[PDB]
Amino acid sequence: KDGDPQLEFKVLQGYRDLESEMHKGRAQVTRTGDIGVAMDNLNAVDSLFNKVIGIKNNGLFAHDARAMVSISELAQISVRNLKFDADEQSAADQQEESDGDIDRNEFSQFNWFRIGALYNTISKNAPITDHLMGPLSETTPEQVKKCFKKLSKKLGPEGSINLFKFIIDPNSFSRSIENLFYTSFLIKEGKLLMEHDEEGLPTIKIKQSISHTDSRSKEIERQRRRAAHQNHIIFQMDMPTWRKLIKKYNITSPFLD
Amino acid sequence: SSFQPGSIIKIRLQDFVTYTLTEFNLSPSLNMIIGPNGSGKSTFVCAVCLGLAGKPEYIGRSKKVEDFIKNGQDVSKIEITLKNSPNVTDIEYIDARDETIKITRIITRSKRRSDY
């Protein structure tokens, strides 16, 4: 009796059938109040546990305890029903229980179905009604490379063009924003730089991208270029600001088509 | 203050991880900062957190502050400038009357925790 899977599972099965039969005696006791069911279930479970003696699987103990609790309640209720030959307390459950057809401790469907039905069937209050009349009264890298290629083509390796004259697309604010998107996401790659012209206007020139045969070497070069002193000039670009830049830097054509 | 409380100004990083020097002229209005990592944007957040009396373990990328200095460098500089709110009061060099405060955290590789 120490570890036979068959014994353990048969204990499980007998106990489950025991649970079903105890639910039957649940209703039996609710109508009547028999103690023999409780005592016999106690004996059955104890005998099965005696067989489980030496077998040591937790679930069997858990379910046995469930049985214990159920049987103890069975016995106590049956004794209460034995002491004298309350009735409403019996009845309301029975009312609830008889409104419990189910297939054969929460609140059932027809429980409240019956109860409300009964009251309606019997209420001396007449029913009521209502109404309403009167109350009725390309992915990212591809666009990135396209825009930066156009920028490099119209910029030149050392030619300098003022920043707004390039970033702005005067024909569309949305296209200008997309162009700035692409331009910045290729600036991560490191083929262009920004300097200052004689008048102090920020002019972009092509930062000659050092040809690195190894991709890792090119990535390290990009990381170093990003690590350079980043003059971070951040300006809000809205339609009023976009047109202000258009008028300030004399921008007439889309730099990045 | 004229701006909203705790308005940040340009932040200067120096000898940080890879950034020997950089300065970000920040924006008091809005910041829709879009872009992935590769130069340490999460490391940038760690820098901002640690340089302002914040434990880096809030995210957990890198823990020891002295290691945030650039490789080959034992001293890094973090100048974070804030438009001092009237709320900040009764602290060293801190008053409601104060306008701009520059927290210059010096991270030393010989010190586990930096000197603000």
Partner: peptide
């Protein structure tokens, strides 16, 4: 401040805002 890896189309914008771009 809001940190994003990428950006999408159809972004209705206004004036008081200030769109950024974190580079890393």
């Amino acid at each position: 401040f809001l940190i994003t890896p990428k950006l999408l189309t159809g972004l209705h914008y206004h004036e008081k805002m200030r769109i950024h771009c974190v580079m890393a």
